[PDB]
Amino acid sequence: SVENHWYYFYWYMSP
Amino acid sequence: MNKQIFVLYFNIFLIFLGIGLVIPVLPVYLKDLGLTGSDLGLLVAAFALSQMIISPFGGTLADKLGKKLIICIGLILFSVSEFMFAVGHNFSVLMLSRVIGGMSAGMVMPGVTGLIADISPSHQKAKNFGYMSAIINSGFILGPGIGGFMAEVSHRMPFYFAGALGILAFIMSIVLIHDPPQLLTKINWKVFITPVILTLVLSFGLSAFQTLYSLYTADKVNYSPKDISIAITGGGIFGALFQIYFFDKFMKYFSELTFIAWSLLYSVVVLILLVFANDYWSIMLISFVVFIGFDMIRPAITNYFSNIAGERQGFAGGLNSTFTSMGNFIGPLIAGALFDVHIEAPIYMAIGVSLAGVVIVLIEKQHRAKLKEQ
């Protein structure tokens, strides 16, 4: 389960 | 080097090329139309402001409405902006072109960063950030160089070349690129303040010097665009070479804070020496070493951010990028207006901000020593 969502000003990696 | 990685890094190198293409053209733009330095600074200031404003919305669109589509739209918008700037007539059309180019840049960067994160594995995060910072800037330095170097035979053909490069990058990305909440509650927010201030000061100083060198050497030594271009590109090359050749040696001897303080003091001393410069070769050689301090500060701040963040390298990278963009937006706006106030006033502003950085870093060192000895 690898998928990156875009929060404000930065990319966070899904748990 | 992978082809997709090459294309993604080109999409950033060209964006920062367009970012920096305007600085060497500032003197002829002042002469032929007739304005103050405030508008010349406000050009780059509004470009960076539009980029910073669009970056969150651009990232949201890339995450939701697809990543490749946003990158392609931003590339075509950047090419359109360059073409429009190449055919501008007054200050308003150039302002609009700068704003739309900044919006395109701010909609491209989040997509390319997402592509970098999603393509490379999880064990290449710090390296990806390091290369990212290295290209983002080896472009913000080479922009003015190439622009002024090639702006000697035509008045606006550099922007034509930028638009052609944008079209080529769009075509190459279309052919090659294929992609078939509580995260802020637990942040301490009381420890990132010093690195945030340091990177903001570094970005502000870099942008302020980029505008001020051009404006001051046009006002005093009546520099040609080619001379400014050659000086800027030579200083950038010298700084990059000296950094890549001595950064490990200086890092292995002393800590980050003392190194930053001594580098800031060196920057102040070169600025003071540049104050009294009055000859072509003298100021050219002085400028040849000004960028050394900033190009040594930037990797130190990057390493400090990486150490202080810990596991959350992405948050540190986002904060660093956002504050660098904010500094690039706040630098030229103050620099041009205060140059219009007084010719040598931006130099005093730069030495003052460097003094602020050195005092904040020395008080942070004092605090660290206090709780270390306690």
Numbering used by the authors:
A (entry chain C): 126 to 140
B (entry chain A): 1 to 180, 193 to 386
The publication says:
Efflux pump antiporters confer drug resistance to bacteria by coupling proton import with the expulsion of antibiotics from the cytoplasm. Here, we uncover the proton-coupling mechanism of the Staphylococcus aureus efflux pump NorA by elucidating structures in various protonation states of two essential acidic residues using cryo-EM. NorA contains two essential membrane embedded acidic residues at positions Glu222 and Asp307 which are conserved across S. aureus strains and required for conferring fluoroquinolone resistance to the human pathogen methicillin-resistant S. aureus (MRSA). Hence, the two acidic residues serve as a “belt and suspenders” protection mechanism to prevent simultaneous binding of protons and drug that enforce NorA coupling stoichiometry and confer antibiotic resistance.
To determine whether protonation at Glu222 and/or Asp307 were responsible for triggering the conformational change to the inward-occluded state, we constructed the E222Q and D307N single mutants of NorA (NorAE222Q and NorAD307N). Remarkably, binding assays revealed each mutant bound FabDA1 at pH 5.0 and 7.5 with Kd values in the low micromolar range and neither bound to the outward-open-specific Fab36 at either pH value. Next, cryo-EM samples of NorAE222Q and NorAD307N in complex with FabDA1 were purified at pH 7.5, which we anticipated would induce deprotonation at Asp307 or Glu222, respectively. Following data collection and processing, we obtained cryo-EM maps at 3.35 Å resolution for NorAE222Q and 3.51 Å resolution for NorAD307N. Superimposition with wild-type NorA gave backbone Cα r.m.s.d. values of 0.73 Å for NorAE222Q and 1.07 Å for NorAD307N, as well as similar interfacial contacts with CDRH3 of FabDA1. Nevertheless, small but significant structural changes were observed within the substrate binding pocket for NorAD307N and NorAE222Q structures relative to NorA, providing clues into the proton-coupling mechanism of drug efflux. A similar trend was identified in the NorAE222Q structure, albeit to a lesser extent than in the NorAD307N structure. The nearest distances of Gln222 (mutant) to the backbone carbonyl of Phe140 and Asp307 to the side chain of Asn137 were ~1 Å longer than in the NorA structure. Furthermore, two rotamers of Asn137 were observed in the NorAE222Q cryo-EM map and were indicative of heterogeneity and a weaker interaction to Asp307 upon deprotonation. MIC values for the point mutants NorAE222Q and NorAD307N displayed substantial loss-of-function, nearly identical to the MIC value of MRSAΔnorA, which underscored their role in proton-coupled transport.
